[PDB]
Amino acid sequence: MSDPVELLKRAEKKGVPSSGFMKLFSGSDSYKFEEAADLCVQAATIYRLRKELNLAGDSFLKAADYQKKAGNEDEAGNTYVEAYKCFKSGGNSVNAVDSLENAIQIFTRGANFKFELGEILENDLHDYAKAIDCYELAGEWYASNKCFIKCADLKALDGQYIEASDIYSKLIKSSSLKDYFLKKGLCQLAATDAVAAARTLQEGQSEDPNFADSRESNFLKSLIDAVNEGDSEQLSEHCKEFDNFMRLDKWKITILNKIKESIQQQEDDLL
Amino acid sequence: MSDPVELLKRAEKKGVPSSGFMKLFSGSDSYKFEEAADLCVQAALNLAGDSFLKAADYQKKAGNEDEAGNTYVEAYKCFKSGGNSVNAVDSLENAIQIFTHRGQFRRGANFKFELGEILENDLHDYAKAIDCYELAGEWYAQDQSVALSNKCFIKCADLKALDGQYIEASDIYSKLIKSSMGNRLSQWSLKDYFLKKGLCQLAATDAVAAARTLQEGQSEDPNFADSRESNFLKSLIDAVNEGDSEQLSEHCKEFDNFMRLDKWKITILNKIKESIQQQEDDLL
Amino acid sequence: SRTAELQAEIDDTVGIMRDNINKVAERGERLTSIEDKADNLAVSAQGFKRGANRVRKAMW
Amino acid sequence: DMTNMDTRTRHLKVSNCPNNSYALANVAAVSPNDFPNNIYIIIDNLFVFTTRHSNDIPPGTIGFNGNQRTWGGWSLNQDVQAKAFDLFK
Amino acid sequence: IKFTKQSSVASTRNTLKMAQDAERAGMNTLGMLGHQSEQLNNVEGNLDLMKVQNKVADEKVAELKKLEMELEIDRNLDQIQQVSNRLKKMALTTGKELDSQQKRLNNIEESTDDLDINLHMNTNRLAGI
Known about the structure:
The structure is cut from a larger assembly and holds two copies of chain A, one copy of chain C, one copy of chain D and one copy of chain E. By secondary structure, chain C is mainly alpha-helical. Chain C has one helix at 2-59.
């Protein structure tokens, strides 16, 4: 097998654009860039065969840059996708994010890779704001419900309860519903807007017969009543009762924890 | 319609590489191989598969590896279709090699899973099926397809446990448990996983490991703690601890009465009961 | 009466799920064919790209 | 005579007992290269057993029976720490 | 009587556990179906784009050629009824997506089928130029 380092060196040698007098006699530089990209792809496939995923990703990136210089944008995007794949497999989240960004720009597929980028940001890099932006954009282009679920979840976890409730309303209108209503109300209750939570509960009960008789509706009504009476212990009891039959998730845990701390803050305002 | 035999003869005539003096005046042989492959594709269930195979070989000689892999996939399709499992296996092997050499490990894994299915059901080559399933699961994991890797690992662990490799099957079950933990989508799979793992550890006479697995499942997964599978595993562990084969049989019947047992579990518990009998032999 | 009503609802849901199993079998069938045809499409698209490139070079 | 013996710690894998006779003797079967013969060895600073030379156990491995594992709560292939022991001191 | 009541309690406990079994499986099925429906939406978009590009290719190629026990029983039945309501809705729900995706898949198959040939058509024509 050819040495990947030698192939990369040859690609770099061929990747130099024609300059000065030579440009008057040398044809289009596109062919040189294409040959350099092919050499980089060969070296990079060799790296992948050797499980050197990061070097293979770097070589795909060089090949994609050469393809861009050659005008073959679609091939550049495919090579960027391969770079993202091997970087992600190699544990290099930053280079995978960069490759996904270039591929998304070239394609704009953009939504699929934007959703993947948001997943990478949320799980690997914990960049929750960028993940929210990616999910929102991916949902908009898809329009979307899944991306909006992810976006609303992250936004509610990020302190943006009103925007999360708005996204939940969009999800409800597009459509999951039984939970949506609940989640929306929870967000409106995290924002201390008990009236909005009651309005959401009434809308869900009147619009969706399934939600009216659903445990989510009763739990939301109990939470609204507890916040109205300012009985944190009653809210905790209702949460335990709801957990006993339907297990709660970390999202709901956080929302209700912030709600209870808001009741405590009201107790602070009581003084 | 053209005669497929005549087309194959023409492809063979065109498929002869240029030799000697003619090579100095004849262009690249790739075009001749391409024409022969096209003729073979036209002429080409078993005969059609053989002709796809010839076309794929000519395409390989022409350098068109992707087309060769596609033709090999068609050959596999028809060999399996003709009841010719061996030629289908061969075609899948060539297609998998072509795809893996081209970086399409996804395709390689898909066709490796299909090859393992063929080996397990059609040829009963259980060792090769286990190898194929393990490799397919590994490649799927490298692609982060958690569910496909999980399916491949389920198949691999099932065959390994049926094959006498209880420890390896339990290890694969542990991997499945770790991969499926925290997912609301695979929980029952987990509920069964734990059970199966414990069963394997009990087939290996490692009751302590089975108890550790039961405790881990109970403490880690609330659903498994209250599941009948947890109670059944605890009952089996207790029965093996007391060496009461009849009690184990009673527990098995009770478990069957509410949740039907499968042939995998049947085999595991049969080997376990025979191990109790072997202990009774060691008792003398 | 409550238990009989529950039994009736469960029987109805079993019927609906049996229907769904038949439908998902039909969906798998639609999907095995579509995967194979999308493979055909990919091969043909690559072949078209290559042929067009060869004509581009010819005309040049 | 326990006056002189190598007290260096060793990490040994728990494996199935070689046979019923060794399990009956309740003596840790070790290779000659592992430790001297007929000396008391402690494991995890809690479990004391008498060593006996055994050629069927490769060096670096320690054999246990089911009851010993139950006492220590150990599984097969588990790694345990072994050192020389001196009860008199 | 006591033994029978105990048996009824155990039966309802298992029925509840299994009902919960059905519910998780059904929720996963719906989640996966939403994701797969969406992948198929992506497929649909590319098929549309390729149709437009094949129109362009058609015209370019053409020009190129031209150029207590009682209470527990009650509570367990309560919960089984609750889960059962959700299971029924899920069965109905899964059926609707299978219907919709089935028609979408039929159209995807036909559109993919066509494009495949349109590409073969233009490839054969280009071969002769």
